[PDB]
Coordinates of N, CA, C and O and ligand atoms in Angstrom, one line a residue:
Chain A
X295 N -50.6 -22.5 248.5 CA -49.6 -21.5 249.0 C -49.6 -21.3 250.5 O -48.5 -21.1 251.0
X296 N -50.9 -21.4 251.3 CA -50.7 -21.1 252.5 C -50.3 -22.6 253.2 O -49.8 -22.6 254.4
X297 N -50.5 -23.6 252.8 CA -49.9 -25.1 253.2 C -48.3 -24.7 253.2 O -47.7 -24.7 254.3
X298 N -47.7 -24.5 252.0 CA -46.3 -24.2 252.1 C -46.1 -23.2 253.0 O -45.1 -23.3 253.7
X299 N -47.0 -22.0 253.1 CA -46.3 -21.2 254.0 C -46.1 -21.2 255.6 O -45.2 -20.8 256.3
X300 N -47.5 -22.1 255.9 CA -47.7 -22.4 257.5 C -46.5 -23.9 257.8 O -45.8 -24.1 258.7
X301 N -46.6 -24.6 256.6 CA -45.5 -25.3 256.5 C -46.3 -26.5 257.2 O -45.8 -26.7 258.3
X302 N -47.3 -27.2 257.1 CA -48.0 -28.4 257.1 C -49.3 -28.6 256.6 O -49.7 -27.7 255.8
X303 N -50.2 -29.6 256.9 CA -51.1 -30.1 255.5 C -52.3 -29.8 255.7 O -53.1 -30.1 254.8
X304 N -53.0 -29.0 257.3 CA -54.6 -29.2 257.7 C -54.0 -27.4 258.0 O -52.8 -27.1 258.1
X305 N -54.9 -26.8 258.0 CA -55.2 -25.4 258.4 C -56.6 -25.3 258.7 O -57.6 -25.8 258.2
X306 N -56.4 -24.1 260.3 CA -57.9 -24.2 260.8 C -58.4 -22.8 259.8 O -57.7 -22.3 258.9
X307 N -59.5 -22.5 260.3 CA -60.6 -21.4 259.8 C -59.4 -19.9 260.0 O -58.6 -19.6 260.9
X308 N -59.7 -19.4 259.0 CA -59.1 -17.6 259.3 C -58.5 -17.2 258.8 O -58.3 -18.0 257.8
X309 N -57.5 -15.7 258.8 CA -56.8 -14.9 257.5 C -55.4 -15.3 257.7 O -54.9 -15.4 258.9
X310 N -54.8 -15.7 256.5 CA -53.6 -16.0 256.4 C -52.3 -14.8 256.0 O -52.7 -13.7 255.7
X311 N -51.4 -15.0 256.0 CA -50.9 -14.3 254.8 C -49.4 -14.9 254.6 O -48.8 -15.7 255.2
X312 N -49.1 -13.9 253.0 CA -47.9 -15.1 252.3 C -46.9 -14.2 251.8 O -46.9 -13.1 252.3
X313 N -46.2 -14.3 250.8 CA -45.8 -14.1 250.2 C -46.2 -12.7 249.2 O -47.4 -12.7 248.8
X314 N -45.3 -11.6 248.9 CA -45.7 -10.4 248.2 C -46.1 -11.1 247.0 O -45.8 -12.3 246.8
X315 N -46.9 -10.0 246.1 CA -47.0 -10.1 244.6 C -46.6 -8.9 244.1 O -47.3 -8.0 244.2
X316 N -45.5 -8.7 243.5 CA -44.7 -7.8 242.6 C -44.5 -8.0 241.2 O -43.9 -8.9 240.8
X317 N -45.0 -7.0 240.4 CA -45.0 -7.0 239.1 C -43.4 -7.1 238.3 O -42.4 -6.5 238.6
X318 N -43.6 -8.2 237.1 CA -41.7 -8.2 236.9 C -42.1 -7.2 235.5 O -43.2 -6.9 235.0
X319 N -40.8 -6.9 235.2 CA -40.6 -6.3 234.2 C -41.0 -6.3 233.2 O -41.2 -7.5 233.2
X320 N -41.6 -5.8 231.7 CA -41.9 -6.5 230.7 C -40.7 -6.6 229.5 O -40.8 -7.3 228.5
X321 N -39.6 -5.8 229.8 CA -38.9 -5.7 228.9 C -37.4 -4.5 229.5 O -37.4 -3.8 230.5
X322 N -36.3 -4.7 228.5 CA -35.0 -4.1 229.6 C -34.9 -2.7 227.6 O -35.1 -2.6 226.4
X323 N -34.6 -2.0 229.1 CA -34.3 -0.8 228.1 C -32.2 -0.5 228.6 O -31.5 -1.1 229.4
X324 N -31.8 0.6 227.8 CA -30.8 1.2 228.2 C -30.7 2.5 227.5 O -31.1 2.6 226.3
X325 N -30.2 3.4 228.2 CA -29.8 4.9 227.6 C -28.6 5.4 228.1 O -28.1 5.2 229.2
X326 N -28.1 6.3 226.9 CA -26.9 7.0 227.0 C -26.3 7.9 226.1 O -26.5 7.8 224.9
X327 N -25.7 8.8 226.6 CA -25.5 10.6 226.2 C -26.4 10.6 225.1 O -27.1 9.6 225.0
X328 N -26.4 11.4 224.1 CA -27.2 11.9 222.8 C -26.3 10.9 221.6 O -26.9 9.8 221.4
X329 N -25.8 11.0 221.2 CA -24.4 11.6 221.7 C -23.7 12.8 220.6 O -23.1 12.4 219.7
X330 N -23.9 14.2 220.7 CA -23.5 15.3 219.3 C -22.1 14.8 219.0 O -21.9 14.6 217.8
X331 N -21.0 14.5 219.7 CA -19.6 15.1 219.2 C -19.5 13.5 218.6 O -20.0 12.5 218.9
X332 N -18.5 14.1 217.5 CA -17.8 13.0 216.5 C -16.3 13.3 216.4 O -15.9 14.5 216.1
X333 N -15.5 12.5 216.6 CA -13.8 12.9 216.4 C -13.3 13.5 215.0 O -14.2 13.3 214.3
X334 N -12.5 14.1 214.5 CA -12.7 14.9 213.0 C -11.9 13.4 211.7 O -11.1 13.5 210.7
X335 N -12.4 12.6 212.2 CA -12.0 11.3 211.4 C -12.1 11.8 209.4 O -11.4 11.4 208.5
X336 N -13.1 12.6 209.3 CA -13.7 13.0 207.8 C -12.7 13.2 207.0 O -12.3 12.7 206.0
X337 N -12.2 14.3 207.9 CA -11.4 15.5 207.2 C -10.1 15.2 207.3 O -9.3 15.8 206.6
X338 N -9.6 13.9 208.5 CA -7.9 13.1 208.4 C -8.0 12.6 207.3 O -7.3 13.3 206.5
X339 N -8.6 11.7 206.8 CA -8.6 10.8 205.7 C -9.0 11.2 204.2 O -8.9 10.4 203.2
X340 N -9.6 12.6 204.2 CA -9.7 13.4 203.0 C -8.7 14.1 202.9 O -8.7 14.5 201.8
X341 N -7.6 14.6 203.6 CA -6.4 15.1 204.1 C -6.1 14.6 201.9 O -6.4 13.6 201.2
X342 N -5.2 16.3 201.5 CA -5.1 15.9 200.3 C -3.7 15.3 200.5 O -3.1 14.8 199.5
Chain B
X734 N -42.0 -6.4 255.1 CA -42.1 -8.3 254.2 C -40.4 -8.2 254.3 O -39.8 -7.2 254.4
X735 N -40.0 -9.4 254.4 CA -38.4 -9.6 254.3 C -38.1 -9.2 253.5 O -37.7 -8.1 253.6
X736 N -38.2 -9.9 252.0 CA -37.2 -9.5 250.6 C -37.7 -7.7 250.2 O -36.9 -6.8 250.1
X737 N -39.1 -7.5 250.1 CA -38.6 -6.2 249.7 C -38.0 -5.0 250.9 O -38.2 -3.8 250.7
X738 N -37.6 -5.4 251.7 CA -37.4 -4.6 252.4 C -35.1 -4.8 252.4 O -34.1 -4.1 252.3
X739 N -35.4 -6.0 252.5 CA -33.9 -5.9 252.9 C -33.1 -6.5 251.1 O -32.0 -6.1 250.5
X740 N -33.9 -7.3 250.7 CA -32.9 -8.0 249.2 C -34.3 -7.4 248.2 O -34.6 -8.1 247.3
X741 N -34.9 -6.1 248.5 CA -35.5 -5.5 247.3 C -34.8 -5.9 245.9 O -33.6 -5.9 245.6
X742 N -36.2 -6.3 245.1 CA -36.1 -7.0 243.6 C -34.7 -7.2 243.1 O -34.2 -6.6 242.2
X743 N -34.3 -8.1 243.8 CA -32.6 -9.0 243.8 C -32.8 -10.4 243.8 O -32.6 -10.9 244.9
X744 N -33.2 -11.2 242.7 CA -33.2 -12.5 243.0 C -32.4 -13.3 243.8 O -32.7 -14.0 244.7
X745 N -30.7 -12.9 243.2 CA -29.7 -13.3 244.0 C -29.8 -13.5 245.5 O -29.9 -14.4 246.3
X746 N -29.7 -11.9 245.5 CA -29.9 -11.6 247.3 C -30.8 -12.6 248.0 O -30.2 -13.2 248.9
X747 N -32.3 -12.8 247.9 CA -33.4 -13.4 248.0 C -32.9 -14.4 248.4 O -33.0 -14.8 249.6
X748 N -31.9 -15.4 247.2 CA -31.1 -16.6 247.1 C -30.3 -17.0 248.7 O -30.5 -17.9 249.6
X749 N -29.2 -15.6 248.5 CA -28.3 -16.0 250.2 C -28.9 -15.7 251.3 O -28.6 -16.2 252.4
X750 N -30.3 -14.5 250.8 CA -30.5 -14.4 252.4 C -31.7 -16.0 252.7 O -31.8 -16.5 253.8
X751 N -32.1 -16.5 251.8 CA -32.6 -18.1 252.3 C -32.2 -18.7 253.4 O -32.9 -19.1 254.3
X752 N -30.9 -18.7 253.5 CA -30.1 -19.2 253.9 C -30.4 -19.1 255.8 O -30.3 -20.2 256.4
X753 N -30.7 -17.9 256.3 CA -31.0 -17.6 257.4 C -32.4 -18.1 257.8 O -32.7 -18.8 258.7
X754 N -33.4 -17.6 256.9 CA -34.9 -18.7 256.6 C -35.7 -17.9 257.9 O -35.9 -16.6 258.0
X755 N -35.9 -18.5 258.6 CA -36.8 -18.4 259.7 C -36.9 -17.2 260.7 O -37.7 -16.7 261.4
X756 N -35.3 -16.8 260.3 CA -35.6 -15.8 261.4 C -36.5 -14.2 260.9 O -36.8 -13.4 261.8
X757 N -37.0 -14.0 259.3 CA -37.9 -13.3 259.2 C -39.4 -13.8 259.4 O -40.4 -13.1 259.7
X758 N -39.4 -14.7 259.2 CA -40.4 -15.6 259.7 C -40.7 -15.7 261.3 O -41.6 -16.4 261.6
X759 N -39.9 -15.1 262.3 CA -40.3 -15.2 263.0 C -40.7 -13.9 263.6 O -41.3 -13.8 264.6
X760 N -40.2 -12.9 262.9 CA -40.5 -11.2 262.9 C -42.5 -11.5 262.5 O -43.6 -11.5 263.0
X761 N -41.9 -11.8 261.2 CA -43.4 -11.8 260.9 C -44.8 -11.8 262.2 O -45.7 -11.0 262.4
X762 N -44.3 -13.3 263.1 CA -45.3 -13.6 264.1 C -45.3 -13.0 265.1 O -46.0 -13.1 266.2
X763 N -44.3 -12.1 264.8 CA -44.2 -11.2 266.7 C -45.2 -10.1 266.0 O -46.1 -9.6 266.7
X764 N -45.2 -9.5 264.4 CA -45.7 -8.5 264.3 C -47.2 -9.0 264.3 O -48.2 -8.4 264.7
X765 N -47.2 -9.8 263.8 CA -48.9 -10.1 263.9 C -49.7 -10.2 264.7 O -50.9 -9.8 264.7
X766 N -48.5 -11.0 266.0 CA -49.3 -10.8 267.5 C -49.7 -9.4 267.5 O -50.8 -9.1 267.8
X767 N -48.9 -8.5 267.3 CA -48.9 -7.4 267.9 C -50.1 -6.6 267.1 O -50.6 -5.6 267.6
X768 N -50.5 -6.9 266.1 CA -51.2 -6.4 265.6 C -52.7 -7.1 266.2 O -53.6 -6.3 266.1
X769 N -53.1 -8.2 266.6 CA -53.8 -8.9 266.9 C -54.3 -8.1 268.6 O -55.3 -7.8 269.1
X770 N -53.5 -8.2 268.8 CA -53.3 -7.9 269.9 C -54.1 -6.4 270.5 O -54.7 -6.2 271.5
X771 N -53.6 -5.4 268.8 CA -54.0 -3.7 268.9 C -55.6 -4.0 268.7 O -56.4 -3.2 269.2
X772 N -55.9 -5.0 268.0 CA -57.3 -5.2 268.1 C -58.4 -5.4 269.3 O -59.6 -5.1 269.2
X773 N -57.8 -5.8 270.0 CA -58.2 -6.7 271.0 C -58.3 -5.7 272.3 O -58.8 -6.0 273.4
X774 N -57.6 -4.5 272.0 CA -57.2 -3.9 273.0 C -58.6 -3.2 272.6 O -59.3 -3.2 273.6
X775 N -59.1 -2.7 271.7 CA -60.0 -2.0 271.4 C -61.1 -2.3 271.8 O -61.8 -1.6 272.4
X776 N -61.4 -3.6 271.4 CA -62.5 -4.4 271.6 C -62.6 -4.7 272.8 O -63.6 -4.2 273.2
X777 N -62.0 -5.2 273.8 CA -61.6 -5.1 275.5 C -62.5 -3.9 276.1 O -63.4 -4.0 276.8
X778 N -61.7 -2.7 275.5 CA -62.4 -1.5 276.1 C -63.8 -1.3 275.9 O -64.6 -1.3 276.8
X779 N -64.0 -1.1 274.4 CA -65.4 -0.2 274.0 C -66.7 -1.6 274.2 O -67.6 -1.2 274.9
X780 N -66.9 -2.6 274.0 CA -67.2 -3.5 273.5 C -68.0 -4.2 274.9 O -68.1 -5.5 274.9
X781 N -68.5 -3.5 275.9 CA -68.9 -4.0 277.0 C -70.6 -4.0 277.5 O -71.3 -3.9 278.5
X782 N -70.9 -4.2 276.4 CA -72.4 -3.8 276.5 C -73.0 -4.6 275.5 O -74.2 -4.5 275.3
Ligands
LIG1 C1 -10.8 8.6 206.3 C2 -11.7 9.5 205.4 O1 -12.0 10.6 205.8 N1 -12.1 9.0 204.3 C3 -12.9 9.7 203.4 C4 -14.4 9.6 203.8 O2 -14.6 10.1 205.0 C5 -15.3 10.3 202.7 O3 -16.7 10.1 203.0 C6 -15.0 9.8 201.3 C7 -15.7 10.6 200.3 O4 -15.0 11.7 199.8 O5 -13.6 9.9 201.0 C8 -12.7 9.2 201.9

C-alpha cells in the first residue's frame, strides 16, 4: 500500500501515510410515515 | 484526506474527482511539510543542551 502510494518500488526508513479506513455499511434499511389513514375503500364496495 | 472531505462516502464522486489526481496529493505534502516543520520548530528552541 505504501509502494502504490509513494508511487515507486524502494522506500527509505520512516512514517508513511495512505489512504483512510472507513467502515461500509452492513446492510440498507428504509422508513416511512406509520402510516394510520386508509381511503374508505370498505364501505364503497359494501355500498348495498 | 481528499475524498472524505470533498466526495464524502460517494464512490461515484471519488470516481470523477480521480480525474484531477495529484492535485490533493499535493495538499497532502505542503501539509506535512508544515507539520514537520511545527516539530522542528520546537526542537530548534528547547532542545539545546
Ligand atoms: C370493495 C369492498 O368493500 N368489498 C367488500 C370487502 O371490503 C369486504 O371485506 C367483504 C366482506 O363483507 O365484502 C366485499
Amino acid at each position: 500500500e505504501t509502494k502504490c502510494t509513494l508511487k515507486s518500488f524502494t522506500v527509505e526508513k520512516g512514517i508513511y501515510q495512505t489512504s483512510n479506513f472507513r467502515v461500509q455499511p452492513t446492510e440498507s434499511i428504509v422508513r416511512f410515515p406509520n402510516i394510520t389513514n386508509l381511503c374508505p375503500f370498505d364501505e364503497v364496495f359494501n355500498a348495498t | 484526506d481528499c475524498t472524505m472531505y470533498i466526495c464524502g462516502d460517494s464512490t461515484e464522486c471519488s470516481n470523477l474527482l480521480l480525474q484531477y489526481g495529484s492535485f490533493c496529493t499535493q495538499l497532502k505534502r505542503a501539509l506535512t511539510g508544515i507539520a514537520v516543520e511545527q516539530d522542528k520548530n520546537t526542537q530548534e528552541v528547547f532542545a539545546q543542551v
